[PDB]
Write an enzyme that holds these catalytic residues in place. Structure first.
Site, PDB file in Angstrom:
ATOM      1  N   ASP A 103       0.265 -67.512 -33.512  1.00 22.30           N
ATOM      2  CA  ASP A 103       0.655 -66.911 -34.780  1.00 22.30           C
ATOM      3  C   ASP A 103       0.457 -65.401 -34.784  1.00 22.30           C
ATOM      4  O   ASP A 103       1.082 -64.686 -35.570  1.00 22.30           O
ATOM      5  CB  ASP A 103      -0.118 -67.558 -35.935  1.00 22.30           C
ATOM      6  CG  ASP A 103       0.284 -69.005 -36.155  1.00 22.30           C
ATOM      7  OD1 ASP A 103       1.502 -69.271 -36.242  1.00 22.30           O
ATOM      8  OD2 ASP A 103      -0.606 -69.874 -36.243  1.00 22.30           O
ATOM      9  N   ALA A 153      -0.515 -77.732 -26.006  1.00 25.55           N
ATOM     10  CA  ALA A 153       0.092 -78.300 -27.205  1.00 25.55           C
ATOM     11  C   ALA A 153      -0.873 -78.449 -28.364  1.00 25.55           C
ATOM     12  O   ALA A 153      -2.026 -78.002 -28.307  1.00 25.55           O
ATOM     13  CB  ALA A 153       0.691 -79.663 -26.867  1.00 25.55           C
ATOM     14  N   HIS A 194      -4.001 -77.841 -21.348  1.00 28.27           N
ATOM     15  CA  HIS A 194      -3.501 -78.336 -22.633  1.00 28.27           C
ATOM     16  C   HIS A 194      -2.729 -77.196 -23.291  1.00 28.27           C
ATOM     17  O   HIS A 194      -3.304 -76.168 -23.642  1.00 28.27           O
ATOM     18  CB  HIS A 194      -4.676 -78.779 -23.510  1.00 28.27           C
ATOM     19  CG  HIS A 194      -4.286 -79.687 -24.634  1.00 28.27           C
ATOM     20  ND1 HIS A 194      -3.367 -79.329 -25.599  1.00 28.27           N
ATOM     21  CD2 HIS A 194      -4.707 -80.933 -24.958  1.00 28.27           C
ATOM     22  CE1 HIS A 194      -3.240 -80.316 -26.468  1.00 28.27           C
ATOM     23  NE2 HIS A 194      -4.043 -81.300 -26.104  1.00 28.27           N
ATOM     24  N   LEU A 246      -3.207 -80.678 -30.998  1.00 26.23           N
ATOM     25  CA  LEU A 246      -4.134 -81.775 -30.738  1.00 26.23           C
ATOM     26  C   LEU A 246      -3.863 -83.018 -31.584  1.00 26.23           C
ATOM     27  O   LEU A 246      -4.269 -84.117 -31.211  1.00 26.23           O
ATOM     28  CB  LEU A 246      -5.583 -81.321 -30.951  1.00 26.23           C
ATOM     29  CG  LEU A 246      -6.318 -80.814 -29.704  1.00 26.23           C
ATOM     30  CD1 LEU A 246      -5.642 -79.559 -29.170  1.00 26.23           C
ATOM     31  CD2 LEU A 246      -7.778 -80.532 -30.056  1.00 26.23           C
ATOM     32  N   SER A 262       5.398 -74.007 -33.563  1.00 29.18           N
ATOM     33  CA  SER A 262       4.553 -73.249 -32.645  1.00 29.18           C
ATOM     34  C   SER A 262       4.239 -74.046 -31.383  1.00 29.18           C
ATOM     35  O   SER A 262       3.915 -73.476 -30.337  1.00 29.18           O
ATOM     36  CB  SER A 262       3.246 -72.854 -33.335  1.00 29.18           C
ATOM     37  OG  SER A 262       2.369 -72.203 -32.430  1.00 29.18           O
ATOM     38  N   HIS A 263       4.343 -75.366 -31.481  1.00 29.40           N
ATOM     39  CA  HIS A 263       4.047 -76.239 -30.353  1.00 29.40           C
ATOM     40  C   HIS A 263       5.243 -77.083 -29.938  1.00 29.40           C
ATOM     41  O   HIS A 263       5.115 -78.004 -29.128  1.00 29.40           O
ATOM     42  CB  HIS A 263       2.858 -77.127 -30.709  1.00 29.40           C
ATOM     43  CG  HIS A 263       1.646 -76.352 -31.118  1.00 29.40           C
ATOM     44  ND1 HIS A 263       0.947 -75.554 -30.239  1.00 29.40           N
ATOM     45  CD2 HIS A 263       1.056 -76.190 -32.325  1.00 29.40           C
ATOM     46  CE1 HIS A 263      -0.017 -74.928 -30.886  1.00 29.40           C
ATOM     47  NE2 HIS A 263       0.027 -75.296 -32.154  1.00 29.40           N
ATOM     48  N   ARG A 273       2.351 -82.420 -44.718  1.00 29.06           N
ATOM     49  CA  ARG A 273       3.485 -81.548 -44.435  1.00 29.06           C
ATOM     50  C   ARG A 273       4.270 -82.042 -43.227  1.00 29.06           C
ATOM     51  O   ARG A 273       5.502 -82.046 -43.233  1.00 29.06           O
ATOM     52  CB  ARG A 273       3.017 -80.113 -44.186  1.00 29.06           C
ATOM     53  CG  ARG A 273       4.135 -79.087 -44.324  1.00 29.06           C
ATOM     54  CD  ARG A 273       3.713 -77.686 -43.904  1.00 29.06           C
ATOM     55  NE  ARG A 273       3.968 -77.428 -42.487  1.00 29.06           N
ATOM     56  CZ  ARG A 273       3.227 -77.896 -41.486  1.00 29.06           C
ATOM     57  NH1 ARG A 273       2.169 -78.650 -41.738  1.00 29.06           N
ATOM     58  NH2 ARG A 273       3.551 -77.612 -40.231  1.00 29.06           N
ATOM     59  N   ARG A 274       3.559 -82.458 -42.185  1.00 26.74           N
ATOM     60  CA  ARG A 274       4.220 -82.949 -40.986  1.00 26.74           C
ATOM     61  C   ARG A 274       4.912 -84.289 -41.205  1.00 26.74           C
ATOM     62  O   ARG A 274       6.005 -84.516 -40.686  1.00 26.74           O
ATOM     63  CB  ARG A 274       3.220 -83.059 -39.827  1.00 26.74           C
ATOM     64  CG  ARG A 274       2.828 -81.710 -39.243  1.00 26.74           C
ATOM     65  CD  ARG A 274       2.002 -81.838 -37.964  1.00 26.74           C
ATOM     66  NE  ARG A 274       0.687 -82.431 -38.194  1.00 26.74           N
ATOM     67  CZ  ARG A 274       0.397 -83.718 -38.029  1.00 26.74           C
ATOM     68  NH1 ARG A 274       1.332 -84.567 -37.628  1.00 26.74           N
ATOM     69  NH2 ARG A 274      -0.835 -84.154 -38.263  1.00 26.74           N
TER      70      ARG A 274
END
Ligand code: NDP
Ligand code: NDP
EC number: 1.5.1.21
Lengths: 337, 332
Positions: free
Chosen positions: B185, B119, B117, B121, B44-45, B305-306
């Site tokens: 989303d 993106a 901004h 955080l 999404s980013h 998860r990331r």
């Protein structure tokens, strides 16, 4: 039905001060806790008003908490203060370091107060409100005893862990919010259990992890759910890390009072961040916040965080603080009357 | 679906930004940020935001060549005028000074104003935690969230991010919008013809709806956790805008700039040395909390998860649909 009576704010403060002194606290601690507890009752924060007196006293009687502890204020940085509450209450510790904290916040622009080894048995708004009244922004976090199941977990671990925020506004009382990160404050469960009533659904579970509305089921082996879901859980984790991890105090699951019959106060810590919103600024924060309030009324939010308490406060000062006759009598007896 | 390496993606995005008018410095910052998101699986980013970045730059709505102005205003306070540029370049310009103050004074604030901004955080707070510091950040966005009990939208999706170090692993990091769902989303659900669960937003008449199209067609979003998330959103407006000097989420609009997609607001960052004057190690305490969380059944910690996706990306490369790669190359 229970017949009620009214007591003035100052009368309630004097009554509670006597109770604390008679039961073993230093006069400084009594002064701080009496005003705090009475202020909660005055504002209608029932769970943390006089409802807490029995718990305060049984905790003191068991030796679990030291009512005569002398806080140790540690100036550890231009913008950092730590306080060893020495197994005493959080409020007296905050009071001991308040002037230093404010001096640092105004000078450096922001300052942190990390209280460790403290017992906090009250609402958090009383801790941030005074800073806002002085034109400063304050954010605070405190963890309690284990009662909340982390999102995706099977057993409780986090405390009800509240977060409070206070900010000045040019046209009125400080904008202040104080919320538990659990769906409902643990105190709410105790009140319901006391009043023999049920809780709204979707706030907690029983010992088997099944949904329940019975406060006793939650208190006896059950647990509370984090508010909003995974996001509230993340914020609760943050409170553990900030109020305990950073301060040096116990996480919500790192203390046991099983050896102290009557103990009810969490032995953890508290974090407070105070900011001068206008440090080196070319504008006035208080004007900006007032505009936000105006815009909020404009879109239909008649009730902003804190308004309810200010309304109750006004009513208490005008008509006096409402208290059950039986409760007033018990407090009078505890004071020695 | 072709596969490109993390550093290759950065180089490609940097070219795209330079080609579209950003300064080399801004291009470096945005390229790494966007590529980092793609690397972590935050689609999404990630590259998905390129069209929005470019459309925003095209009209001049955001200045791709802005030069941040750092203001050292206190032993523990730094302000930065983003000068209508992106927030990340402003943060980068004052980062070293901010860290010096945090380590010296014990805590320090960075108040960014007049920034855009576009993106996530977590990229803003993670670096501080990697350096053993604790960081909390708030950014207000654009009006679309109805304050609890109100009739019309006022707050932005206003996200809050938190990063803290741990002795036995990557930083504990959470990044969440205070809205019930992120705007991006809602767009996705609309495109996929998916309905949203109850409580995410309302239609143009203020009525509850599950139709993402109804939310986008003049509707609005609701705060997460009712009155509690709403209070936190109000706090974000006050801290990211009221304190910084930037616009509140409702103090700007895109009516005069076709294609504008970025909010023109501000950002607040609080960086703390958790061990300043401490008779313990914060990183050891946080590691114990992690162990206890695993002990009670929480398998997934915020950020896990990331980090898992990140490892895969570094080991097998970043997989991207050939279609997207081709257009990125064309834009380049
Ligand atoms: N260990 C400890 O010491 C602990 C203490 N607590 C305390 O108990 C508490 C009560 O907390 P909790 O139950 O979460 O409180 P709530 O759920 O009542 O209130 C959260 C807050 O929400 C605002 N609010 C409530 N309803 C609305 C509404 N309809 N519209 C707009 N704003 C609204 C409140 O304002 P307002 O007050 O004016 O109604 C306040 O800031 C706190 O005071 C907390 O500090 C909780 C856990 C542990
Ligand atoms: N103006 C702007 O720049 C705006 C930016 N945003 C951005 O968009 C975003 C996505 O946000 P939002 O939709 O709220 O994200 P979510 O609702 O997915 O995630 C909130 C977060 O929750 C944690 N989390 C999610 N699920 C679980 C779980 N099952 N167990 C434990 N932790 C969990 C996440 O970890 P994890 O990361 O590992 O998944 C993360 O910290 C953010 O990155 C935000 O910064 C939003 C609004 C405005």
């Amino acid at each position: 039905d229970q017949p009620t009576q009214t007591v003035s704010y100052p009368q309630l403060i004097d009554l509670l001060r006597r109770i604390f002194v008679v039961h073993g606290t230093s006069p400084e601690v009594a002064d701080v806790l009496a005003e705090n507890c009475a202020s909660a009752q005055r504002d209608g924060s029932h769970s943390h008003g006089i409802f807490r007196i029995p718990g305060y006293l049984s905790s003191l009687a068991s030796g679990w908490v030291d009512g005569k502890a002398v806080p140790v204020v540690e100036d550890v940085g231009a913008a950092f203060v730590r306080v060893d509450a020495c197994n005493g209450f959080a409020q007296p510790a905050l009071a001991a370091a308040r002037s230093l904290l404010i001096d640092k916040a105004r000078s450096a622009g922001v300052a942190i107060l990390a209280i460790r080894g403290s017992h906090h048995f009250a609402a958090l708004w009383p801790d941030v409100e005074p800073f806002a009244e002085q034109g400063l922004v304050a954010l605070s976090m405190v963890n309690s005893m284990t009662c909340v199941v982390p999102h995706g977990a099977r057993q409780p671990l986090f405390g009800t862990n509240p977060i409070a925020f206070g900010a000045p506004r040019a046209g009125g009382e400080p904008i202040v919010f104080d919320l538990a990160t659990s769906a409902i404050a643990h105190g709410d469960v105790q009140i319901a259990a006391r009043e023999g009533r049920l809780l709204p659904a979707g706030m907690g579970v029983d010992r088997d992890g099944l949904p329940t509305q019975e406060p006793r089921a939650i208190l006896d082996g059950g647990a509370l759910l984090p508010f909003g879901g995974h996001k509230g859980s993340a914020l609760s984790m943050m409170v553990e890390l900030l109020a305990a991890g950073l301060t040096g105090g116990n996480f919500s699951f790192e203390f046991d009072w099983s050896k102290h019959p009557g103990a009810q106060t969490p032995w953890t810590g508290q974090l407070l961040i105070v900011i001068d919103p206008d440090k080196g600024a070319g504008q006035h924060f208080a004007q900006r916040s007032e505009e936000l309030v105006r815009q909020l009324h404009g879109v239909g939010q008649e009730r902003l965080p804190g308004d309810r308490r200010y309304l109750e406060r006004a009513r208490s000062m005008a008509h006096g603080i409402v208290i059950a006759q039986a409760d007033l009598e018990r407090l009078q007896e505890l004071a020695g009357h």
